[PDB]
């Protein structure tokens, strides 16, 4: 074929693209908000005293003295790091204790602890779904679900947000291809991947209809509980307790320990028949070091506090309803979410054609609000990587720490600032 | 005594054949197959050779 | 590439008889696994394994049987060698919670006894920073009191703290690079930042024995992945030549980028990457280098700066330097170091920076204190002494093991020591016999190693004294006599 001289000329004349493309200096995500001290209620952000309405600390367990005391006890017992994976002496008694406590809390047979909140579902999904399987995923699914779906090589069938007619149409179509080819159908697995409370929309899934569709079309259900794990239900057990569904009807329930438990990590709970697979198939579990014992003890103490006092979920619900009702009626903003959601959104009623203009407007509102002692944050996404990119929005997060008058003041300040900016 | 030496030899046989990983009845099944094959081989060898 | 110091690695070939016996053992054990599946099929024996619920028996089965044939029949039989719970700080000596199984490792019952003072060869603490007392523990306690455990947001959101910026500045000064960024998990560091650097139209030249995180990061990005032989610079150079000359496969367009993923130390093999040759090749062929430096960032280097310092090379020649804080520093997390442009792009476009929770404040404080101890800012010579002590332990242990007659893989300077067991039954036997003799070791087979070469990995530590090493070596000699594990022909 080619001469050696031609090949060396080709090698000489090849110029690769730069490793990273040039990044605009006027990038919103380029400027981080520096928080001085803990990210708690009444925090300091960018050198300003502010009431926190941004961090996903729903139950106020970040600066709970009991949680800190438990974490300090575990720190003095074990130190910080685990120095190995769960397979190789990285399993402490705190990890087994936390798994047992989570399984007993969720009324399930088994739970598995991941050391990273993204990784728990990004590794749970590929473990069960393989090449040739069909996954029906809500289009408004979080990025971790998307990367778990990409890591598996299965077919992906996005259906419209909370639309059971769209999901049922997709299922009937898949039934048609099942009729066309029987042998491949007998070995093809079907998964419905949903999120109990969606972070990108602040809405709740139609779980009873999901269960009925699961039994009619024989598709196992994976349920993401990152937002709803500690906020929903009488005992704060998730959307299953909210709707009254038996937890056995859900094949996998994955949450992260970072929002309500206020510590690093994630977990997946379900029947041992399902969970035992991940201990050898979950890549984020097998090939990563286990969670530090102090974080595990903090999570255990958070579980103790949630079990001892289940009125925190009631006060969280009433505060969510209060802020949701108060925020209704903004001149240029629309509240996107449900009254029972602790984290919802404030999107633009009329969006300019350019998305970065919308982001700049929302950041103007956010900055003027931080000048007024309110720490708000704008929902950040990877524009190119997101499958269904959500609209730019300001994220409103409710916490039991935020008092009633603080909620009213936050609503009024947001109203005034937004009506000034959008005028 | 030398019985302990033969016990170590049996242990080495277990390690090599992976019978160490198996349950006692699986070990008995394997040994029955082994002595059966040995007997058939000895029978054929004496009959012709 | 030019080597200032000699580069001595040995990977002795498997003895022919040993490989034959390994195949025989695997074959008989697979036949017995087939018999076990047949027996369980007509329920001749009870099923200890869990089964799909009756309401869901008409679904397509969740697992294909043959897929877990390994897990149920191969791995389950010697499962007691893994997931051993520890109830103490994983230092040189660790406390193991004794457990027993009356159903052949299907379920374990935890006896009240605790096995105390086990010589720890499994944990990663190379520099002995796994302590429950000391300055790092006190600093972490103070920061835990001030901040609490965990943060409840993302870096791009309100989850960026002054602790994170302090840590990133310190890490950049430690490595020798312009800038660095920190992540909550090293596996996440790889899987979430490789997709940001490269995409479709780029090429990833990945080592044969790369970590699962590197493989996942390469797969999540849409780039083409080509595998070269482990530390084979001839194979890598041939791949680079062909990739540049022939372009992308379907349409022979020139590649946008070529990224070479290598590791500083490959833990399972114990080999140190041929970094001078890799840097020479990437300079000649205009490739980019991604150096995963998890097992060498504290373990290697006269001052513990990693493989780059170990070879005396310029840190600026490596485009991306991954590292992990778990192995040597004694705290979870990961980092990427590089030029300021790279780190700014990653802060903007990393998946972890946008969607994943930040590092825990006590964890970053322990990392900060350990790093300052290593780089001499603690005001005490303890950080240096750790580096010389780890080097001495590595040399002593490797020399003693090799002159005992075992087959030891890897570079002579690598603190991870893989010892070849080569037989599936010996994998379980070695772990059980070593724990019986009060040494905790790690044994690995298929999910981490290839078929014939199953091994036992010793992680050496600066916490290990010479008395501890002597005890471990004496028991290893005894067990190698017992299990006939001295397969070497060259030395014994
Ligand atoms: C005959 C049957 C043999 C059975 C062999 C099974 C072996 C199980 C190994 C599981 C753990 C792997 C951890 C990898 C280390 C790592 O990724 C670190 N970098 C994380 O800290």
Nearest to C185 by CA among A119, A82, A146, A113: A119
Contacts of A386 (CB under 8 A, 6+ apart): A143, A146
Measured in angstroms, how far is the CA atom of residue A408 from the centroid of ligand 1? 53
C-alpha to C-alpha distance for A133 and C146, rounded to whole angstroms: 48
Other Cβ atoms less than 10 A from the Cβ of C266: the count is: 27
Contacts of C83 (CB under 8 A, 6+ apart): A86, A87, A91, A279
Are A369 and A291 within 8 A, CB to CB?
A: no
C-alpha to C-alpha distance for C204 and A23, rounded to whole angstroms: 23
Contacts of A26 (CB under 8 A, 6+ apart): none
Nearest to C46 by CA among C84, C113, C103, C109: C103
Please state the φ and ψ torsions of residue C10, each to the nearest 5 degrees: -140, 125
Q: Report the chain A residue with the minimal C-alpha distance to residue C443.
A: A88
DSSP for A160-222, written as a single string: -TT-HHHHHHHHHHHHHHHHH-HHHHHH--EEEEEESB-TTT--B--HHHHHHHHHHHT-EEE
C-alpha to C-alpha distance for C129 and C299, rounded to whole angstroms: 12
C-alpha to C-alpha distance for A140 and A341, rounded to whole angstroms: 16
C-alpha to C-alpha distance for A242 and A237, rounded to whole angstroms: 8
Contacts of A278 (CB under 8 A, 6+ apart): A112, A123, A124, A127, A268, A285
Could you tell me the strand order of the sheet in which C320-324 lies?
Answer: C179-183, C334-338, C320-324, C288-292, C258-263, C203-207, C224-228
C-alpha to C-alpha distance for A296 and A280, rounded to whole angstroms: 21
Place of tokens 């009729």: A179
Instruction: Give the long-range contacts of residues A9-14, CB within 8 A, separation 24 or more.
Output: A10/C244, A10/C245, A11/C241, A11/C244, A11/C245, A11/C285, A14/C244, A14/C254, A14/C286
Judging contact as 3 or more Cβ pairs under 8 Å, the answer for B and C is yes
Phi-psi region of C251 (alpha: psi -120 to 50; beta: other; left: phi over 0): beta
3-state percent breakdown (helix, strand, coil) of chain A, nearest 5:
45, 15, 40
C-alpha to C-alpha distance for B10 and A391, rounded to whole angstroms: 71
B-C contacts (CB, under 8 Å): 44
CA distances from C33 to A255, A304, B13, C36, C432 (A): 36, 44, 19, 5, 22
Contacts of A133 (CB under 8 A, 6+ apart): A152, A154, A155, A188, A189, A190, A191
Please state the φ and ψ torsions of residue C180, each to the nearest 5 degrees: -150, 160
Nearest to A345 by CA among A395, A390, A308, A306: A395
> What are the residue boundaries of the structural domains of chain C, listed by start?
11-120+382-492, 135-374
> What are the residue boundaries of the structural domains of chain B, listed by start?
22-49
What residues are paired with A195 via a beta bridge? A224
Other Cβ atoms less than 10 A from the Cβ of A405: the count is: 8
DSSP for C412-450, written as a single string: TT-SEEEEE--SHHHHHHHHHHHHHTTEE-EEE-TTTS-
Flag whether residue C24 sits within 8 Å of chain B, measured between CB atoms. Answer: yes
Place of tokens 């030398």: B2
CA distances from A275 to A271, C50, C458 (A): 6, 10, 30
What residues are paired with C440 via a beta bridge? C120
Q: Considering CB atoms only, which of A32, A188, A262 is closest to C150?
A: A262
Are A349 and A334 within 8 A, CB to CB?
A: yes
Please state the φ and ψ torsions of residue A321, each to the nearest 5 degrees: -60, -40
Token pair listed for B49: 């050779």
DSSP single-letter state for residue C75 = I
Count Cβ neighbours within 10 Å for each residue of A129-148 and write b for 16 or more, e otherwise: beeebbbbbbebbbbbbbbb
Nearest to C129 by CA among C485, C461, C442: C461
Nearest to A274 by CA among A103, A149, A150: A103
**Coil vs helix vs strand at A280:** helix
How was this one solved? Answer: cryo-EM
Are A334 and A414 within 8 A, CB to CB?
A: no
C-alpha to C-alpha distance for A233 and A241, rounded to whole angstroms: 5
Are C435 and C99 within 8 A, CB to CB?
A: no
**What is the DSSP pairing of strand A134-138 with strand A110-114?**
unpaired
Overall residue count recorded for chain B in this entry: 49
C-alpha to C-alpha distance for C132 and C91, rounded to whole angstroms: 9
Place of tokens 């009959």: B47
Question: CA Rg, chain B, in Å?
Answer: 14
- Count Cβ atoms within 10 A of the Cβ of residue C388 and give its class: 0-12 exposed, 13-18 middle, 19 or more buried: exposed
Token pair listed for A289: 């070091």
**Cβ–Cβ below 8 Å for C158 and A288:** no
DSSP for A91-142, written as a single string: -BHHHHHHHHHHHHHTT-SEEEEESSHHHHHHHHHHHH--TT-EEEEETT--
Nearest to C303 by CA among C388, C408, C190: C388
**What fold, for C11-120+382-492?**
3.90.1150
Q: Report the chain B residue with the minimal C-alpha distance to residue C22.
A: B16
Token pair listed for A19: 């490793």
C-alpha to C-alpha distance for A67 and C388, rounded to whole angstroms: 39
DSSP single-letter state for residue C29 = H
Q: CA geometry: angle at A140 spanning A137 and A146, to 5°?
A: 60
Are A63 and C148 within 8 A, CB to CB?
A: yes
Are A296 and A98 within 8 A, CB to CB?
A: yes
Token pair listed for C393: 């332990």
Question: CA Rg, chain A, in Å?
Answer: 23
Nearest to A331 by CA among A270, A229, A421, A226: A421
What residues are paired with A346 via a beta bridge? A335, A394
Give the closest residue (by CA) to ligand 1 atom 7: C444
DSSP single-letter state for residue A31 = S
Place of tokens 């990653």: C346
C-alpha to C-alpha distance for C1 and C289, rounded to whole angstroms: 15
CA distances from A389 to A139, A205, A341, A394 (A): 10, 19, 21, 15
Token pair listed for C240: 């680079």
Overall residue count recorded for chain A in this entry: 423
Chain B residues at the C interface, defined by Cβ less than 8 Å, are 12, 14-23, 26, 29-30
Q: What is the largest CA-CA distance in chain C?
A: 70
Q: CA geometry: angle at C98 spanning A264 and C104, to 5°?
A: 100
Are C454 and C442 within 8 A, CB to CB?
A: no
Place of tokens 């290697």: C300
- The reply to whether C267 belongs to the active site is yes
Half-sphere exposure of C146 (CA within 13 A, CB side): 15
Are A293 and A92 within 8 A, CB to CB?
A: yes
**Cβ–Cβ below 8 Å for C148 and A188:** no
Token pair listed for C361: 């404040």
**Please, what sign has the CA dihedral across residues C245, C248, C252, C257?**
negative
Nearest to A323 by CA among A406, A391, A379, A204: A406
Note the CATH architecture for domain C135-374. 3-Layer(aba) Sandwich (3.40)
C-alpha to C-alpha distance for C14 and A386, rounded to whole angstroms: 49
**Please, what sign has the CA dihedral across residues A364, A368, A374, A375?**
positive
Token pair listed for C233: 């610079």
Other Cβ atoms less than 10 A from the Cβ of C129: the count is: 32
The active-site residue out of C267, C296, C328, C360 is C267
Token pair listed for A123: 């590794």
Are A21 and A33 within 8 A, CB to CB?
A: no
**Cβ–Cβ below 8 Å for C130 and A274:** no
C-alpha to C-alpha distance for A402 and A42, rounded to whole angstroms: 9
**Cβ–Cβ below 8 Å for C32 and B17:** no
Other Cβ atoms less than 10 A from the Cβ of C404: the count is: 18
Please state the φ and ψ torsions of residue A350, each to the nearest 5 degrees: -115, 115
Are C355 and A390 within 8 A, CB to CB?
A: no
Place of tokens 């028949």: A273
Which uninterrupted H or E stretch holds C272? strand C271-272
Are A309 and A353 within 8 A, CB to CB?
A: no
DSSP single-letter state for residue A290 = P
**Cβ–Cβ below 8 Å for B20 and C21:** no
User: Which runs of consecutive H residues, i.e. helices, occur in A268-385?
Assistant: 272-281, 283-286, 293-308, 312-327, 355-370
Other Cβ atoms less than 10 A from the Cβ of A401: the count is: 19
CA distances from C42 to A181, A312, A370, A416 (A): 30, 52, 69, 73
CA distances from C409 to C9, C149, C328 (A): 7, 40, 21
Resolution (A): 2.6
C-alpha to C-alpha distance for A399 and A190, rounded to whole angstroms: 37
**What is the DSSP pairing of strand C265-266 with strand C203-207?**
unpaired
**What is the DSSP pairing of strand A377-378 with strand A393-397?**
antiparallel
Are C461 and C92 within 8 A, CB to CB?
A: yes
C-alpha to C-alpha distance for C131 and C88, rounded to whole angstroms: 10
- Count Cβ atoms within 10 A of the Cβ of residue A262 and give its class: 0-12 exposed, 13-18 middle, 19 or more buried: buried
Could you tell me the strand order of the sheet in which A252-256 lies?
Answer: A110-114, A266-270, A252-256, A220-224, A190-195, A134-138, A155-159
Nearest to C333 by CA among C480, C150, C471: C150
Count Cβ neighbours within 10 Å for each residue of A162-199 and write b for 16 or more, e otherwise: bebebbbebbeebeeebeeeeeeeeebbbbbbbbbbbb
C-alpha to C-alpha distance for C342 and C180, rounded to whole angstroms: 9
**What is the DSSP pairing of strand A190-195 with strand A134-138?**
parallel
Is any ligand 1 atom within 6 A of the Cβ of residue C447? yes
Are C164 and C180 within 8 A, CB to CB?
A: no
**C contact test, residue of B4, B17, B18, B29 with most C CBs within 10 A:** B18
Nearest to C120 by CA among A81, A291, A83: A83
**C contact test, residue of A83, A97, A121, A282 with most C CBs within 10 A:** A83
Are A196 and A224 within 8 A, CB to CB?
A: yes
DSSP single-letter state for residue C345 = H
Nearest to C152 by CA among A312, A384, A64: A64
C-alpha to C-alpha distance for C13 and C219, rounded to whole angstroms: 32
Other Cβ atoms less than 10 A from the Cβ of C169: the count is: 13
């Amino acid at each position: 074929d080619l001469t050696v001289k031609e090949k060396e000329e080709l090698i000489e004349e090849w110029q690769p693209e730069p490793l990273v493309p040039p990044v605009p200096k006027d990038h919103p995500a380029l400027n981080y908000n520096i928080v001085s001290g803990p990210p708690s209620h009444k925090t300091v952000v960018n050198g300003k005293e502010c009431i926190n309405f941004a961090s996903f600390n729903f139950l106020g367990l970040l600066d709970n003295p009991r949680v800190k005391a438990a974490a300090l006890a575990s720190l003095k017992k074990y130190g910080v790091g685990t120095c190995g994976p769960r397979g190789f002496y990285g399993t402490f008694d705190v990890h087994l204790d936390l798994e047992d406590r989570l399984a007993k809390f969720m009324k399930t047979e088994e739970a598995i602890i991941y050391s990273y909140g993204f990784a728990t579902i990004a590794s749970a999904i590929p473990a069960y779904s393989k090449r040739g399987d069909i996954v029906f995923v809500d289009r408004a699914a979080c990025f971790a679900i998307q990367k778990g779906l990409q890591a598996s090589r299965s077919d992906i069938k996005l259906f419209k947000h909370n639309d059971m007619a769209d999901l049922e149409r997709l299922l009937k179509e898949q039934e048609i291809e099942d009729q066309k080819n029987p042998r491949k159908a007998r070995v093809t697995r079907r998964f419905i991947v949903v999120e109990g409370l969606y972070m990108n929309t602040g809405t709740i899934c139609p779980l009873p209809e999901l269960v009925k569709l699961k039994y009619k079309y024989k598709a196992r259900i994976f349920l993401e509980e990152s937002l709803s794990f500690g906020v929903l239900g009488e005992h704060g057990r998730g959307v299953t307790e909210h709707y009254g569904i038996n937890i056995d009807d859900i094949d996998l329930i994955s949450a992260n320990m970072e929002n309500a438990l206020a510590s690093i990590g994630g977990f997946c709970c379900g029947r041992s028949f399902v969970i035992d697979h991940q201990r050898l198939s979950g890549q984020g579990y097998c090939f990563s070091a286990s969670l530090p014992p102090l974080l595990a003890a903090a999570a255990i103490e958070a579980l103790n506090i949630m079990e001892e006092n289940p009125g925190i979920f009631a006060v969280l619900k009433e505060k969510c309803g209060q802020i949701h009702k108060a925020l209704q009626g903004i001149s240029g903003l629309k509240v996107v979410g449900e009254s029972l959601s602790p984290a919802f959104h404030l999107q633009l009623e009329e969006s300019t054609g350019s998305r970065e203009q919308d982001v700049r407007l929302l950041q103007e509102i956010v900055d003027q609000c931080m000048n007024r002692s309110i720490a708000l944050t704008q929902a950040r996404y990877l524009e190119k990587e997101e499958k269904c990119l959500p609209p730019p929005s300001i994220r409103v997060v409710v916490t039991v720490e935020q008092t009633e008058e603080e909620l009213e003041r936050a609503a009024s300040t947001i109203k005034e600032v937004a009506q000034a900016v959008l005028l | 005594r030398a019985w302990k030496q033969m016990s170590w030899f049996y242990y080495q046989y277990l390690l090599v054949t992976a019978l160490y990983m198996l349950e006692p009845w699986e070990r008995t099944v394997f040994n029955s197959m082994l002595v059966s094959i040995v007997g058939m081989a000895l029978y054929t060898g004496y009959v012709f050779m | 590439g030019l080597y200032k110091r000699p580069f001595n690695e040995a990977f002795e070939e498997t003895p022919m008889l040993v490989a034959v016996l390994t195949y025989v053992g695997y074959g008989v054990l697979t036949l017995f696994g087939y018999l076990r599946d047949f027996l369980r099929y007509w329920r001749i024996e009870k099923c200890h394994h869990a089964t799909e619920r009756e309401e869901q028996k008409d679904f397509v089965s969740l697992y294909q049987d043959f897929e877990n044939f390994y897990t149920r029949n191969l791995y389950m039989r010697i499962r007691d060698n893994w997931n051993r719970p520890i109830c103490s700080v994983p230092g040189a000596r660790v406390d193991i919670m004794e457990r027993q199984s009356h159903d052949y490792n299907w379920s374990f019952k935890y006896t009240g006894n605790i096995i105390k003072g086990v010589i720890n060869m499994g944990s990663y603490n190379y520099l002995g920073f796994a302590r429950n007392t000391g300055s790092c523990q006190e600093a972490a306690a103070k920061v835990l009191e001030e901040y609490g455990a965990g943060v409840c947001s993302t870096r791009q959101e309100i989850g960026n703290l002054d602790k994170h910026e302090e840590l990133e500045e310190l890490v950049a000064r430690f490595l020798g690079v312009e800038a660095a960024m920190a992540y909550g998990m090293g596996f996440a560091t790889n899987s979430m930042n490789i997709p940001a650097l490269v995409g479709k139209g780029c090429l990833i030249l990945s080592d044969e024995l790369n970590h699962a995180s590197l493989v996942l990061g390469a797969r999540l990005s849409g780039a083409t992945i080509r595998i070269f032989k482990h530390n084979n610079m001839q194979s890598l150079e041939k791949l680079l030549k062909d990739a540049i000359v022939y372009g992308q496969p379907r349409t022979r367009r020139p590649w946008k980028k070529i990224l070479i993923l290598v590791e500083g130390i490959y833990s399972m093999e114990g080999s140190i990457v041929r970094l001078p040759e890799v840097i020479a090749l990437k300079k000649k062929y205009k490739a980019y280098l991604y150096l995963d430096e998890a097992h060498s960032i504290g373990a290697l280097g006269p001052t513990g700066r990693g493989v780059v310092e170990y070879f005396g090379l310029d840190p600026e020649d490596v485009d991306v330097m991954m590292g992990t804080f778990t192995k040597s520093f004694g705290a979870s997390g990961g980092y990427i170091g590089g030029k300021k442009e790279l780190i700014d792009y990653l802060r903007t476009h990393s998946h972890s920076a946008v969607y994943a929770t930040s590092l825990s404040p006590p964890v970053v404080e322990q990392i900060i204190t350990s790093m300052k101890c290593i780089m001499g800012q603690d005001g005490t010579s303890l950080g240096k002494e750790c580096v010389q002590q780890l080097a001495e332990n590595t040399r002593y242990f490797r020399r003693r093991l090799k002159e005992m007659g075992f087959i030891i893989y890897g570079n002579e300077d690598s603190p991870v020591v893989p010892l070849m067991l080569y037989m599936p039954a010996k994998i379980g036997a070695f772990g059980r016999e070593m724990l019986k003799r009060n040494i905790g070791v790690v044994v690995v087979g298929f999910p981490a190693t290839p078929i014939i070469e199953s091994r036992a990995r010793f992680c050496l530590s600066a916490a290990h004294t010479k008395e501890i090493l002597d005890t471990a070596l004496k028991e290893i000699d005894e067990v190698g006599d017992l299990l006939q594990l001295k397969y070497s022909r060259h030395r014994l």
